[PDB]
Ligand binder design. Sequence first.
Ligand SMILES: C[C@H](NC[C@H](O)CP(=O)(O)CC1CCCCC1)c1ccc(Cl)c(Cl)c1
Lengths: 661, 695
Amino acid sequence: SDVYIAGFFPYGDGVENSYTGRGVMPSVKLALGHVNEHGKILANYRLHMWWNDTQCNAAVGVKSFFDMMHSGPNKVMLFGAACTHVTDPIAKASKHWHLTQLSYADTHPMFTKDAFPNFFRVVPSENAFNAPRLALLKEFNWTRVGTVYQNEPRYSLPHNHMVADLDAMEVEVVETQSFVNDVAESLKKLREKDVRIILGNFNEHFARKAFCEAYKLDMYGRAYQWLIMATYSTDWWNVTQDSECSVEEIATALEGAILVDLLPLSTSGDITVAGITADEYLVEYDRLRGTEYSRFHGYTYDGIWAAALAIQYVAEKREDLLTHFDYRVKDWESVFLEALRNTSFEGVTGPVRFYNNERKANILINQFQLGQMEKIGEYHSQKSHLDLSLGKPVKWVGKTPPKDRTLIYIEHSQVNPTIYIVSASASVIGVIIATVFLAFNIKYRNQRYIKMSSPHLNNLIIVGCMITYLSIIFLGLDTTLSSVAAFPYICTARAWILMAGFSLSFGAMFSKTWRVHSIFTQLFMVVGVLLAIDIAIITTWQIADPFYRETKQLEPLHPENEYCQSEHMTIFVSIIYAYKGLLLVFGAFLAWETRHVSIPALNDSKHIGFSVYNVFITCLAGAAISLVLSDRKDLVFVLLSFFIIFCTTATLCLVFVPKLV
Amino acid sequence: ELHIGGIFPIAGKGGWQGGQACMPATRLALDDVNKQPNLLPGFKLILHSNDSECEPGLGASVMYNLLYNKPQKLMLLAGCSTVCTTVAEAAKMWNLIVLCYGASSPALSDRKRFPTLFRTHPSATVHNPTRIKLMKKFGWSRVAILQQAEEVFISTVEDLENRCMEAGVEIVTRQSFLSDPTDAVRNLRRQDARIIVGLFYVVAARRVLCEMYKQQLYGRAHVWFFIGWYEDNWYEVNLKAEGITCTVEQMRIAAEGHLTTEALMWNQNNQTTISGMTAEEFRHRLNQALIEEGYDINHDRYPEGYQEAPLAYDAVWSVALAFNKTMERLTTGKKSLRDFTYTDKEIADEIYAAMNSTQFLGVSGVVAFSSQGDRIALTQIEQMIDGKYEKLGYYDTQLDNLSWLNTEQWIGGKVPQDRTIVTHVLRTVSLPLFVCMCTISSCGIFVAFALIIFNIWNKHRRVIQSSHPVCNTIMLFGVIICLISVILLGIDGRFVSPEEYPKICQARAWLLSTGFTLAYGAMFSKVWRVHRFTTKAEPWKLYTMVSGLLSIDLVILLSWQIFDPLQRYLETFPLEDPVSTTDDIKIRPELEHCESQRNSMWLGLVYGFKGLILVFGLFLAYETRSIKVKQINDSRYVGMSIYNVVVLCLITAPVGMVIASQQDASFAFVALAVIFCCFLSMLLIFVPKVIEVIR
Ligand SMILES: C[C@H](NC[C@H](O)CP(=O)(O)CC1CCCCC1)c1ccc(Cl)c(Cl)c1
């Protein structure tokens, strides 16, 4: 009446991952005592754990396993080691002894059923951290996540399964970074795209380095959301090992990060198979544990209970457990395998039940808030459910979860009725004044006005002045007030009428200047001739170069220009501007030459010269601002409309009939 | 009677069942260790063995059975890398040395996991120094890798990359497939690679071979570094079974001219080994012994692990030599090899020291072990020519000794390059064209200076006396400068070093602008003075305006030169196919266009200044049809010439920018047009003067 189990622990002194061995042995003793002191579970049996200290060494573990196989009482099961490189040789070697191995702390994501048929895992693997994080992406709307993971296999297969699993959930990976020793480069590559939700797989030291860099480069919070697996030590951010970032500095980048970890004990009030709730077992473990602690104490307790269950099943089926146990006989293993597949019991860590070979265990989810790691909720994997109300409320930086994709709206420009309404009113007043001056010129054939400059040319220049105001109103109109399909025509109205304004206003003065030029040593058709020089070319705009607006959205800070045709402009508009400038400089130079010539039968030549001078300077300034300061149409209009109206009013006031008493 | 343990993968499925030939060979060595020689003075070395079937679980079971039974073992022999890792990593606990005859995994080279592991089988990363030496021997620096990603080729490729970074070899691609390389070898001819190293098994090797004919990745422009330990006829076997759509003829055709680098497992020389026989003699004896086991190798069908039998033989001989030295050192006292226990550290350490200092000629060559337990092997290089392997040479990795037999048959007679080398050639103006233009410009300068000298009659005769001679002198001096600028416009980088080419580039613009300004301070400003005199109705009112024009354009040119000059904007063109060379040289043309930062701004400013002056002069000459003046008597000619000069300057500048990318025609037009602009504007002004002065 004595059944034995073989156990492998990282015990003794200073060995790597020793805390996982010295912190679970009290739980092993607790479970052994509870099983032995329990009825109706196994009778005429006494579960004895023969355990050996595998000093985190693949050789010591194998030697210990061979020692317990060669000599001593027949061990009916293996309690797997807590280190991957220790249990893997044992798992490979024990397959020819027909033994079933049960792990208590090994989370490595490679102990799958196909490679290790006899390796059952009470503690879930790292792949079990994929589901909770991807659950949070469903709770808070995040459909665009970046992934950075350590190149080690322990943080590689879980990442591959994650990126192959979030595909079905309409979540698009933006980037995938796999560092080796430098996380800063991975973070810079991640920021190359505008990704805000990050999923990270790395160890505690590399987590400290990653948040070190995430402070170095600005990813501190309020816009960047983190989602990492955190099976680290307690207060891992408090250990000073990163790149000089102090604890009061590594915490700033950690604020508002969601971390998924293994739940140590079940928080439900269910009664375990031991007859005591998880809280009573926790009290017993805290009393009999002293100073050592490990997150796997409940898991190793449940592993010992599962081993007892499997042995009870084997005894119930095969009566000759202690008198016919042979390592070389295969069927025994099969029986235990079946005994380990019918395992379904409530333990101190939840419902223990092996699905493929692993166990679906609840995943604790906590978040760094106010310089502390506060529990947020639990992800139940048996019945997949993200209970976020169990722990503290999810504290966001601000009032809203960080957005997966940055949003900046853009809606046109050129507006502010005022800038336009005041210009329209000024143009209305200007055309009113022009019509008043036309009426004052209508009273011709009366003394000086009869003998002054040709009043017909005066009506032509007044028509020019009014059509300049019509031109500025047509040019200022935008696509938000009129139909977009009317953009070419108004663009044509931007050109043609403007080309009219120069023709009927500058040409009228040019004809008088040419007369004075012909004098120093039937005629107004020259204006029409000048009109030709534009109208024909304007036709060549429409016939072969249709207008196409270019919408350029440039620097949309926390607007897009609607300029005219996207066609030949440095070949066409440059020609127009050069020809106009040639006319301007010609008129100015002949006016300078014809300064003090009185030459009666054509009066007010000096005022015509003054008008041509102001036209020259104002047109030069307007062309300069149009070809240089074309930032947005609003600024161009607010800078050019005043100049245009001032110059036009000067032209229509200087020469018409100033006072003449 | 010393005992050793052996694990031989004989009766298994899959993996490397190399024990089938490696078990008898050891047996032979056993005899040659204990039967004939006095190698063990009073000892008979025995070997207890069992099958592992090339799996780690059965290897561990065999190791347990050997190490936990009555006959004490002093050494463990293991086969494949899985069993070698299973045994060697756990061997330190029992204080045993593990010698592996068939462990080629690079992961076994770390002494921390395996403190007592020796491998007489060369590691998989032993060809990499040889591949790099071959790459540096033919001048190749751009190479690509075609992997299979089997956890063994990853380590070899990593070692190859790290060694390449120490040799300057640049890797273009790292294409890696798993089962089908179609979408892994197709991208090879996207980042076009000529030198490609293949890191796959034979099963993937045949498929890769079949996937480089329809992709046309073979021939004179590509070289493949295949793995050298395939079967000799590895391209004409297992055809129908695999999805190889290709044929044996094309199987062989593209196997031509590929280099295979291999670890030597048989002694290439005829020297007698320490075993008492040569490599060929051992091969014959092994052939004789293997047919007893049930093999018909007389008509081929060799057993698995046949190529590694010398490794097992030399492993046993190394064990025997190390044991002999161990007892020779141990005689200085009472401890012996017979009284050995698994807890005896001193004897195990002595045996480790003996196995460290082993250097003997065995069937596989000079057997010795490196500091990390790896086998120091002499690599061998061969090349497949017409479906047969010819040995190019051998390479010693420890010390650079590349014994080369010059039998490499490169197609075309020359080593292929690692890329299509591009050569940039400067397109220049045609030499006869430049020479003719320079001669014409020299004639123009000569005739201009002739007229300047002829202007001696300024006081003597009234025709030139009443023609404002200073204006004509200014015109001629501008013509000379502008013709010199024309000469400087044909001097491209072919005639001057590029480091001083921007000097000529700036001088061209400076001289041209100065010459044009001086040629219109006399062709247009004289017309302006004529018009002003006619309207208002002498020498200061012309020279001052000339000086003002010179001041403004000199300020513009000085600002252009100081604030933002032009250096070089050598253009490009499509990669031209050169003359017949039967080689991959791509010749690309480059021009010598000048371009400043704001070249458009400066050019527009200068051209607008010139155009304003040109239009002013044209219109003034239009007003100067017939207003002949007594003191400026040549007012009708130097106006007649303004028309043609204006039309030339308004027809040259526009089309010049259009044809500026054509080196010859652009220079030809910008030279001939200026030649005419300075020839008719010279003749019309001065030949009537010469006709009138003498008659
Ligand atoms: C040269 C090399 N020697 C065998 C090697 O040491 C055994 P290994 O190191 O255990 C690698 C095995 C992996 C599974 C399939 C066979 C190779 C070899 C010889 C023949 C073949 Cl078919 C192969 Cl794949 C490899």
